[PDB]
Amino acid sequence: RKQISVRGLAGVENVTELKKNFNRHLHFTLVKDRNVATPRDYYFALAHTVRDHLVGRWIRTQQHYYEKDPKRIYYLSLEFYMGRTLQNTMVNLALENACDEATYQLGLDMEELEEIEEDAGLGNGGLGRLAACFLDSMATLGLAAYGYGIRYEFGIFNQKICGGWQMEEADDWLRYGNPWEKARPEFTLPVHFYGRVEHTSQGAKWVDTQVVLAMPYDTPVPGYRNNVVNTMRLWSAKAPNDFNLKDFNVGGYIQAVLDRNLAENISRVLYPEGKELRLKQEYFVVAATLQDIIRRFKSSKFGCRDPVRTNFDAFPDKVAIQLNDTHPSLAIPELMRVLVDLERLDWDKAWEVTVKTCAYTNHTVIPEALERWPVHLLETLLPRHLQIIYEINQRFLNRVAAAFPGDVDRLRRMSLVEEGAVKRINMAHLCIAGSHAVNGVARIHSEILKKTIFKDFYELEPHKFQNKTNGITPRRWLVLCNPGLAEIIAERIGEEYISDLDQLRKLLSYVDDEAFIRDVAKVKQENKLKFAAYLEREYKVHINPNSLFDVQVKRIHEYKRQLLNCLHVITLYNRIKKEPNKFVVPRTVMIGGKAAPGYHMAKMIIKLITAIGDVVNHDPVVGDRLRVIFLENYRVSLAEKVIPAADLSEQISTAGTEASGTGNMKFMLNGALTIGTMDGANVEMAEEAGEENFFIFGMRVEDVDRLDQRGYNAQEYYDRIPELRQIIEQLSSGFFSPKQPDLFKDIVNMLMHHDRFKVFADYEEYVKCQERVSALYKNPREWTRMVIRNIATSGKFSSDRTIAQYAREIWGVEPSRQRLPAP
Amino acid sequence: RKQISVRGLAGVENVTELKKNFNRHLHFTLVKDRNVATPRDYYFALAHTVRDHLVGRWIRTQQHYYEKDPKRIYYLSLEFYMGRTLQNTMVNLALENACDEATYQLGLDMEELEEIEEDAGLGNGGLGRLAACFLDSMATLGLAAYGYGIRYEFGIFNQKICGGWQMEEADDWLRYGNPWEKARPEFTLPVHFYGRVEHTSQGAKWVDTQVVLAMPYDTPVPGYRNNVVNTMRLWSAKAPNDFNLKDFNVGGYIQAVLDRNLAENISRVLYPEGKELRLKQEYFVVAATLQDIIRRFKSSKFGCRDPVRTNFDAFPDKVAIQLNDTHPSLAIPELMRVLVDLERLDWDKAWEVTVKTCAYTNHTVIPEALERWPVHLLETLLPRHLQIIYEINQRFLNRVAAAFPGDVDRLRRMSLVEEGAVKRINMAHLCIAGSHAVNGVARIHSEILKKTIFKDFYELEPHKFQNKTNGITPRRWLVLCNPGLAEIIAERIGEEYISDLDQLRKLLSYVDDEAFIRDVAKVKQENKLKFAAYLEREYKVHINPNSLFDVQVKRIHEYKRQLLNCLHVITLYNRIKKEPNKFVVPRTVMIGGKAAPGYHMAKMIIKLITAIGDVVNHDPVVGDRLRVIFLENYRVSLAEKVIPAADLSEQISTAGTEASGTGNMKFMLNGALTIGTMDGANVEMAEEAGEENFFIFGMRVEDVDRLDQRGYNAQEYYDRIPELRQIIEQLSSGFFSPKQPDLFKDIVNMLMHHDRFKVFADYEEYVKCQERVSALYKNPREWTRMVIRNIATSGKFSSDRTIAQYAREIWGVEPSRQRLPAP
């Protein structure tokens, strides 16, 4: 009876007894054979093999925390950007080149198979990709972290450059199935919606509700090489499949069928403010999750164990809910609703635990883009919750009054309920009220949630504000992505670095050495040949390799400045042309990110970049003196192979607009010079690397704040800076497009007359700087010099670090670097 | 490529190497362990374990036919009443023993786990059951055969008699999946609804249609110990839904997200009238399969003996289509629409081939019941099919005129268009024109299709009409259901019988061997007591495993007299009650059968039994001399359990209504004596058995026609038979319903004033039989003597023989009983 144990299921490190497993699954799982099986079949066969070799470990980890009962720390997020599991299972488990030998002794090619894998489309950018990284490093740091979010049938679109434009051609990543996940029909809970309250003797009822079933799916995330492998648990919406008539509800009219789609497509599309669905989605992910959070606190070990009627006195000891951004916020009104209403905890006692369990990571530098909801939206889907939100509030605000008698303008600046032309609830204030700890994403930024945006909140509970300077992850962002460069490091410092990281600091001593100089430009010249290969293979281009390899891969969006780039690269096309022999360093510039539907300036700016392309790379006057590639469909699998041929990381956003920056850290690692306007995280990177090692141009936070106080007007620069007069002219007189001359005319007036982001004011400073970048390119080795002093610097911009910080001052729980036995 | 071999995995016969994979499926394939895992995960880990045995042999057989290249025969049926895999998968492949031993040692009672499997609601009744036996024997007889059905997500209801009334209840059998089915998304093909027929060039096109995608799901069908495993390809109707921006359709208005629903539920449900849903389901199956048949005809091997068209010339030699009932019928215009429109063969080359290729099995004896569909319905979802039924109908009538020159009414009776109020097409006459053979499913029923129902048709193509009487399979319905009856029979004649049932005739020499007579009786006694325990466990009331087990389990319908049984039952009830001290042979009548929603007298007659048993199973005056049990939710599962435990087999259909039986041949075989009218099925079953060993009773067909001349007037028997007049007044005063007397009034009134099925005509002689029954049963020695005589002569009813004749006489292919090796 006890003979159903984890014993024997594989022979690990054996090329041959996993060569017995690639066969096992092709036949018995996939029901295919060698005369009929396809590439995508042998990737699904390989996918399964490394997977039994994951879920072995997953049983015993999972076993461990029942016995050992840690504080289970759930990270709540509506975006989870993983993106290609196979290789990353292989390294954090070991089996990679022991999977390479089997799959060539078999006669395949594990790298050709690897590219059959669609990206696990649960994201869009850095809110998913941060947590996707924190999921790797919590798993490595011994921590009992659970990641819970929603499983999107389609994620967010796949982009398509056609005619120069973006066509958002949808991503059905999951149609051929997904190796890595397990469905769990057995642990389906309901999500109730709409309904109404109805009070009784002891509490209140929220009867009359519509329901949407919550079905869980388990991807696992391995910890790096210490054998603990954790659970992502992502929800799927099932419409109640009582339907055809039961309740006799359709009777007189079927059209409640419109429930089936408007409920069930909670789970089909991720977004790219004013939407019942974004809130329905939001309430979906927190309800199901928190019901599961309560069943491991009771059932799994406290099922039996009480003391205090298995009260929640020991809840905050055992559980910690970390709301990433404002999208989990209904975790405070829903947690309060279950403890008070379903169990029967005092409003006061239940709110005790609530704040103690919860804390909230803050991502915006802007107060204007900070989630708030309409009360008519609340009150109708969520009545009890519009009611508990009202009640948390005067309770909070009287606590404010105790600490500020008579200061009336604060009971409307602290308030939960916004007023006037649509009374809204400010969700970020709701969070700060029930979260014992808020953190800024960068140092600077935590200051500006003290000094500017939650000033009152920091005056009254001074201490909730923490800082955790968000990093990246060695495994993904050095080892998978640039292994030639993780090759030449290993043996010098000791592999202790990938899970203990400012040790990168040693290679600093190694700078001078003219071995390391010639060493590294190979990685970068090989990389710039392999990526300059891939370029022409998928899609196609005609490139240098050797070029200055210049890249900026962000969202196409005004305040990140793809535009500043475009002006400059029209200075470059035009001066090199003017004197056609005017030698300068030939750059291949790559701009790329998706836009966001119903964003025409961010549709326009793709089109200017795909208007240039034509006249530069096809004006064979220029030849290979200048090239601008647009990266169609930039996502996490492209993220790990363009930072790779990063000479130049152009992170050129207006000062004080970026709240931080993550795809900038995994750039001064791979060997990339970061040239950009100072704010966000372009800062601490230079406070580490030294300003002289960086290339910080242009304005700053402080003199930008100056500028819109004595009038900012971009023209004035139009009348002075003679080449910008040139490029504005040629921009406007159908140079790029003879067929539609006017075309970039909506962008001219934008650039001229209502430029919120001062693209023209940071022009000149940018060019008498990217002259310092070009002229230094062709000083081919003291170029290669600084590219080491950036690498050495690293360990703060590593998410292991950040997780230890969250671990330690906010959660409690002490980290680990120990290897759990077996597999 | 060679390294990836089948060579195996199959340590096969080995306990250790499969306690070992019941562990892998529990930990690595299902991801559970002994601390989380429940019964469902254990049966599923067993279920998964056996089908690695199953799918290796699947691989191997499929390969074989690719190599050999046999004539393949596809069998279209809208119901495959598959019912419960595992125990049969294990007996057809031998692992009852090893799987028992491995789960013995594991701590798991292998009986218990089995009864967690959900009966696959891919069927409804007899029409579904013969296909399933026609697939077991198509596989034991080595034929290259396919099963093409609909993968009903929910199926026809679950009976749930609540307080006495049949409640309808949905069946999601596949909640926690199906281990046995393997979805083949690679083979999704489109099914074209509605549209316009535009005419051009050498042909016609069908433009403007609406695609639904038919997605295939493969299930293995293993043969008893011969190592072949054939296919069953079920089609899932998955709505084309890229309905999110694409086509400039949604947004404008998502009024039209109904092609989600009425595309999607071509497969959510099975039926119980003029429904476009029923015809949409009928064409969906046909579109997805004929395009899959030609997919396989074109791909496996033939487009090289292409000498001529991958010729359809040879299509009838590599293909054979069986049309079980007129439901696959649109397959004769679909195999004409592709061959003519698409392939571009001659119209008379498409008919020469369409008639040589497909064939029609008919199952009816009552003509109204022959299928018809309105040309308004066809002119719409099937524009071009209407035009192929219109040129078929026209050319067939030429054939007819020349054959019977001048007979203007023969042209109007031999037609496929048919009008009066609503111009319908006759689908059964469509089948005779497009099939090389038409066949009855029983001897006399096959005569009265050329004697009466298609007689003109017959005279014009006499050579099409064959017969083939129905049969059970020896494996599910004697080995699985009754392994007890199985040891004893094999101990004497050997085990060659399972694959050749006529060897049961050999047991007829052991009639007078009173070891065997006390032995068979033993056998039937544990059967009656493992079953009698089913009852006070799942369900209850009181059993007495001695009594004469009298089951009638047909579906609830007026033409099959559940009512005659109700009246015999209270006649015994009353004789037991006026004269308590008389000795009476006690009986337990068990009536089970799924009524059929909408139909009220079936609804109402079930409430009879659920009120007769309440009144008589609570009479401490009778004590236990009678008990009446409605068997809730008859399915393949309880037939397994019921036919096994029964003594009398109640087959009381009105003479002239039944065509052939199939339910009978399971009780005849498992040693039960038929009581039954001479009518279609009971007739070959008494040719073999000898009338002696049957309880033939009452009214014969021309006895039914004698009274259907002079006229039925039930009242003449009411005032000529006192024991009837007796219970009409039991009913009418409301004995069985003290709170609602008048409840069974419309039954009383039906019965007398308009009983189209002649309950009272048969009453007196059916009773003078029930009690001769009671004579022989109270004579256990001579009961078994007559029961030996049943089980021995029943061999003619193996589907191994009904198939041995289709194959031979119709499909062409010749039966084979040899092994393959298949690791």
Q: Is A298 annotated as a binding residue?
A: yes
- Asked if residues B49 and B20 have their Cβ atoms less than 8 Å apart, the reply is no
User: Among residues A619, B497, B443, B527, which one has the least CA distance to residue B451?
Assistant: B443
Q: Whose structure tokens read 């008494």?
A: B686
Query: What residues are paired with B288 via a beta bridge?
Result: none
Q: Which of A23, A38, A170 lies closest to B4 in CB terms?
A: A23
* A476 annotated binding-site participant: no
- For the record, the structure tokens of A429 come out as 């204030």
Q: Whose CA is closest to A590, among A640, A555, A564, A627? A: A627
- Does A66 touch chain B if contact means CB atoms closer than 8 Å? yes
Side-chain-side CA neighbours of residue A358 (13 Å): 30
Task: Please tell me which residue in B19, B51, B363, B424 is annotated as part of the active site.
Answer: B363
Give, to the nearest 10 degrees, the angle between helix B780-793 and helix B514-537: 90
Interface mutation vs chain B, best among A1, A31, A171, most B CBs within 10 Å: A31
Query: Does the distance separating the beta carbons of A170 and B177 come in below 8 Å?
Result: no
Instruction: Select which of A129, A384, A468, A555 is catalytic.
Output: A555
Q: In the Cβ-directed half-sphere of A222, how many Cα atoms lie within 13 Å?
A: 28
Provide the token pair at B598: 């909408």
β-strand pairing of A673-674 with A648-649: parallel
The DSSP secondary-structure symbol of A778 reads T
How many whole angstroms separate alpha carbon A28 and alpha carbon B6?
10
A48 burial class (0-12, 13-18, 19+ CB within 10 angstroms)? buried
Q: Give the span between the Cα atoms of B792 and B472, in whole angstroms.
A: 15
* CA A736 to each of CA A257, A550, A620: distance values in angstroms, whole numbers, following the listed order: 51, 22, 15
SS (H, E, C) A409-449: HHCCCCCCECCCCCCEEEHHHHHHHHCCCEEECCHHHHHCH
- Is position A819 annotated as part of the catalytic site? no
Q: Do domains A1-471+799-821 and A472-798 have the same CATH topology?
A: yes
CB of B609 closer than 8 Å to CB of B628: yes
Can you list the pairs that A539-542 forms with residues at least 24 positions away whose Cβ atoms lie under 8 Å?
A539/A632, A541/A617, A541/A627, A541/A629, A542/A617, A542/A624, A542/A627
Return the residue of B nearest to A219 by Cα. B31
> How many CB atoms are closer than 10 A to CB B221?
26
Non-local CB neighbours of A192 within 8 Å, separated by 6+ positions: A206, A209, A210, A211, A287
Residue length of chain A = 823
- CA distance to partner chain B, nearest, from residue A28 (Å): 5
Beta carbons within 8 Å of B69's beta carbon, 6+ residues apart: B300, B301, B318
Dihedrals phi, psi of A127, to nearest 5 degrees: -105, -30
Helix (H) or strand (E) holding A227: none
Strand partners, A548: A587
How do strand B424-426 and strand B372-374 relate by DSSP bridges? antiparallel
Measure CB to CB from residue B35 to each of A66, A177, A241 and give the nearest one. Answer: A66
In DSSP terms, A373 is beta-bridged to A425
Residues B134 and B801: their CA atoms lie apart, in Å, by 10
Quick count: other Cβ atoms within 10 Å of Cβ B707?
Answer: 14
Select the residue from B6, B22, B28, B57 to test the A interface by mutation, using most A Cβ atoms within 10 A. Answer: B28
Report the length, in residues, of chain B.
823
How was this entry determined?
A: X-ray
Identify which of B4, B37, B63 has the shortest CB distance to residue A106.
B4
CA distance B499 to A10: 41
Indicate the pairing of strand B424-426 with strand B417-418.
Answer: antiparallel
> Which residues 240-259 of B have a C-beta within 8 angstroms of A?
242, 244-246, 257-258
Tally A–B CB contacts below 8 A.
Answer: 112
Q: How far apart are CA B120 and CA A602, in angstroms?
A: 53
Helical pair A96-105 and A86-93, crossing angle rounded to 10 deg: 120
A33 is in an annotated binding site: yes
Q: What does the domain layout of chain B look like in residue ranges?
A: 1-471+799-821, 472-798
Distant-in-sequence, close-in-space partners of A807: CB < 8 Å, separation ≥ 6: A138, A141, A143, A813, A814, A815
CA distances, A132 to each of A84, A409, A636 (Å): 12, 41, 11
CB-based contact, B39 to chain A, within 8 Å? no
Query: For the purposes of burial, counting CB atoms within 10 Å of the CB of B615, is it exposed (0-12), middle (13-18) or buried (19 or more)?
Result: middle
- Is B450 a residue of the active site? no
Query: The tokens 């009780």 sit on which residue?
Result: B667
Phi, psi for residue B353 in degrees, rounded to 5 = -75, -50
- A28 touching chain B per CB within 8 A: yes
Number of H helices and E strands in chain B, helices first, is 32, 23
Using a CB–CB cutoff of 8 Å, tell me whether B514 touches chain A.
no
Cα separation, A645 vs A589, in Å, equals: 11
Structure token pair of residue B451: 């004697």
Closest CA to A468 of A145, A223, A808: A808
CATH number of B472-798: 3.40.50.2000
Q: Please check whether residue B106 is in contact with residue B19, taking contact to mean a CB–CB distance below 8 angstroms.
A: yes
Cα–Cα distance measured from residue B323 to residue B325, given in angstroms and rounded to the nearest whole number: 6
**A287 C-beta neighbours (distance < 10 Å), count:** 23
Q: Which residues of B are annotated as a binding site?
A: 33, 66, 295-304
A 10 A CB-CB count for A783 gives 18
Side chain identity at residue A516, one-letter code: F
Q: Note the CATH architecture for domain B1-471+799-821.
A: 3-Layer(aba) Sandwich (3.40)
Structure tokens at B355: 């008639």
Residue A772 touches partner B, C-beta closer than 8 Å: no
C-alpha closest to that of A362 among A284, A473, A273, A453: A453
DSSP state of B713: -
Q: Measure CA of the first residue to CA of the last residue in chain B; give whole Å.
A: 19
Q: Pinpoint the alpha helices (H) of B107-156.
A: 110-114, 126-140
Cα separation, B330 vs B342, whole angstroms:
17
Q: What is the DSSP string of A493-504?
A: H-GGGGGS-GGG
Q: Is A560 a catalytic residue?
A: yes
- What is the distance, to the nearest Å, from the Cα of residue A571 to the centroid of all Cα atoms in its chain? 34
Contact status, residue B214 vs residue B236, Cβ threshold 8 Å: yes
Nearest alpha-carbon partner for B289 in B344, B215, B204: B215
Which residue bears the tokens 């310092």? A772
A752 touching B (Cβ < 8 Å): no
- Give how far the C-alpha of residue A656 lies from the chain's centroid of Cα atoms, to the nearest Å: 20
Residue/partner pairs of A730-738 with CB below 8 Å, 24 or more apart: A730/A570, A730/A574, A731/A570, A731/A608, A735/A615, A736/A608, A736/A611, A736/A612, A736/A614, A736/A615, A737/A611
Which residue shows structure tokens 């493969």? B218
User: How far apart (Å, rounded) are the C-alpha atoms in residues A644 and B703?
Assistant: 93
**A418 — contact with chain B (CB < 8 Å)?**
no
Interface check for B170 against chain A (CB to CB < 8 A): the answer is: yes
Calpha distance A280→A210 (Å, rounded): 12
How far off is chain B from A655, nearest CA to CA, in Å? Answer: 38
Place of tokens 């998968």: B89
**Pairwise CA distance, residues A624 & B675, whole Å:** 97
Q: HSE of A395 in the Cβ direction (CA atoms, 13 Å)? A: 13
- d(CA B118, CA A600) in angstroms, rounded, equals 55
- The partner residue sitting opposite A28, judged by closest CB among B9, B31, B258, is B9
